[PDB]
Design a protein around this ligand. Structure first.
Ligand SMILES: CS(=O)(=O)Nc1ccc2c(c1)S(=O)(=O)NC(C1=C(O)[C@@H]3CCC[C@@H]3N(Cc3ccc(F)cc3)C1=O)=N2
Length: 557
């Protein structure tokens, strides 16, 4: 069937949409080539509609059913709990989209009777009706890129009342089931340090390692009704309260499988028969379905000593080489199988023989050296999109601070340390906003973070070496430098100079600010301070951080 059917009604915005990079007195300190940076708007949604709309065929074989059997056996060991309304309400982001039914995210968060009443009525209707399609909204995402333009990605989500109900029925399932079913292959269980460790240990466990990323073309659109019913059958294996079983069946039939699409103006835009990108089960559903199809395709292709790492639709496979000819043929069979399962590639996958050439979760492994001269592996990326987004956030407040998410996940990198840390701490100092909690997204869930807790956060996720890395690889250095030239970003020498001021300013203020100056900017000075384990790091409550993925899942921690 068709991933989508369209009426002709346009996908519409709520507010005016800026596409040109907004400029203020701080923009030029970061980036000169403003016209390189753009944001997507609803006005390009028609272009995206074209791409995501296609027929899906699916041919399922013994490997497919075999792997599914294994997954269900593992799922059967999972006991999951129903969340109370209030419990589910407290998981709602403060900024989440308001209900069509007279209340908003803040009414949910502070448990207004109006919100709670409606949520109970929604839950009741779920138990009683397992057939009536549930309305969704389709919106266009506003996201920031550098020019090579990408059309806007789309988001499809049910009403707020429904979203709290999903949490009630499925928050525990989607948080706990994936690791049990997929074990070490489940990517969202790892911090950056743990993930790079897993990638490096896996690479080193092969006699002759070969690896590849598999880019499915528009994954969500490839997801069929079969896939969604299959994922429900996996959920149903869990030990669940009777109400949870019924609500899960109901949400599957009425929401997850498909439904009508409505724009922000309330006009019918068409019908969805594929994965909605804005439901609680988006990340878990995609991860299970990706792992099932890939695991079975590995068996079809007869990959040797094959290890998978899966983050939703993001997949990397590391195995034993049979030489370049056989590896290319193997990957073709793997791709043929994935295609039969309804997950054809975007870019065809290529076998890689150097771990550092493999991009997965938008990141590649690279090497640097710590204080002792010891080798340290870390995850990095082309800093173009991070810097384009940082530029936008220099002039505009956004509900999610990409810059902060990037500093947290890419702390050990040359570009996050030299540029992002220097620029944004300078801004926080000038506004006297060091103390102010900032929102960011980690594995799709929303967190309120205090920038002053960064040293502890970084110690916990990357280790102390994150504060002492040097002697970066020529390849990493060249990619960073070439990016700075492209965007018109001041050279790293300018950033070192600026950093020395930021550092001294932070040290002058004492307390947690001085700690930031000491740890985050030790790289900026010749005569370094001694960086010992931070006392406060040991008390940090980072439970919930690297448990599961929640992209589009409307989750706040
Ligand atoms: C839509 S889906 O099917 O869930 N696919 C998906 C793939 C990959 C996904 C996500 C979703 S996500 O929206 O949960 N966030 C992330 C993610 C993050 O949340 C953080 C935040 C900033 C980027 C960072 N990265 C890159 C990354 C990942 C691991 C790592 F150790 C270092 C860096 C990520 O991979 N990756």
């Amino acid at each position: 069937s068709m991933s989508y059917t369209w009426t002709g009604a346009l996908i519409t915005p709520c507010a005016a949409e800026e596409s040109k990079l907004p400029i203020n007195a701080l923009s030029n300190s970061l980036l000169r080539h403003h016209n390189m940076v753009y944001a997507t708007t609803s006005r390009s949604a028609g272009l995206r509609q074209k791409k995501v709309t296609f027929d899906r065929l699916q041919v399922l074989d013994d490997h497919y059913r075999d792997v599914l059997k294994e997954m269900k056996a593992k799922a059967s060991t999972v006991k999951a709990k129903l969340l109370s309304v209030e419990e589910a309400c407290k998981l709602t982001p403060p900024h989440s989209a308001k209900s069509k039914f007279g209340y908003g995210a803040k009414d949910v968060r502070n448990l207004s009777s109006k919100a709670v009443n409606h949520i109970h009525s929604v839950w009741k209707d779920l138990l009683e009706d397992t057939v009536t399609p549930i309305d969704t909204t389709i919106m266009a995402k506003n996201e920031v890129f550098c020019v090579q333009r990408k059309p806007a990605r789309l988001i499809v989500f049910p009403d707020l009342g429904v979203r709290v109900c999903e949490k009630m029925a499925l928050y525990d399932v989607v948080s706990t089931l994936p690791q049990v079913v997929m074990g070490s292959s489940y990517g969202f269980q790892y911090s950056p340090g743990q993930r790079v460790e897993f990638l490096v240990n896996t690479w080193k466990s092969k006699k002759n390692p070969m690896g590849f990323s598999y880019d499915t073309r528009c994954f969500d659109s490839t997801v069929t009704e079969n896939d969604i019913r299959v994922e429900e059958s996996i959920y149903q294996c869990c030990d669940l309260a009777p109400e949870a079983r019924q609500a899960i069946k109901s949400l599957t039939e009425r929401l997850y499988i498909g439904g009508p699409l409505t724009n922000s103006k309330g006009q019918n835009c068409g019908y969805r028969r594929c994965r909605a990108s804005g439901v609680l089960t988006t990340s878990c559903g995609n991860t299970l379905t990706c792992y099932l199809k890939a695991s079975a395709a590995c068996r079809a292709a007869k990959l040797q000593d094959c290890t998978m790492l899966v983050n939703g639709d993001d997949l990397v496979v590391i195995c034993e080489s049979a030489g370049t000819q056989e590896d290319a043929a193997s990957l073709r069979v793997f791709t043929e199988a994935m295609t039969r399962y309804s997950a054809p590639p975007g870019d065809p996958p290529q076998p890689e023989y150097d771990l550092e050439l493999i991009t997965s979760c938008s990141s590649n492994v690279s090497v640097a050296h710590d204080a002792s001269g010891k080798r340290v592996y870390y995850l990095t990326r082309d800093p173009t999109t991070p810097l384009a987004r940082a530029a936008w956030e220099t002039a505009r407040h956004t509900p999610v601070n990409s810059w902060l998410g990037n500093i947290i996940m890419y702390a050990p990198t040359l570009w996050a340390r030299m540029i992002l840390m220097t620029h944004f701490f300078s801004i926080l100092l000038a506004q006297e906003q060091l103390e102010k909690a900032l929102d960011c997204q980690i594995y799709g869930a929303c967190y309120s973070i205090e920038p002053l807790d960064l040293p502890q956060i970084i110690e916990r996720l990357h280790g102390l070496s994150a504060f002492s890395l040097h002697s970066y690889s020529p390849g990493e250095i060249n990619r960073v430098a070439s990016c700075l030239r492209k965007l018109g970003v001041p050279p790293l020498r300018v950033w070192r100079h600026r950093a020395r001021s930021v550092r001294a300013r932070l040290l002058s203020q004492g307390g947690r600010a001085a700690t930031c100056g000491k740890y985050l900017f030790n790289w900026a000075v010749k005569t370094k301070l001694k960086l010992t384990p931070i006392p406060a790091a040991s008390q940090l409550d980072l439970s919930g951080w690297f448990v599961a993925g929640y992209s589009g899942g409307d989750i706040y921690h």
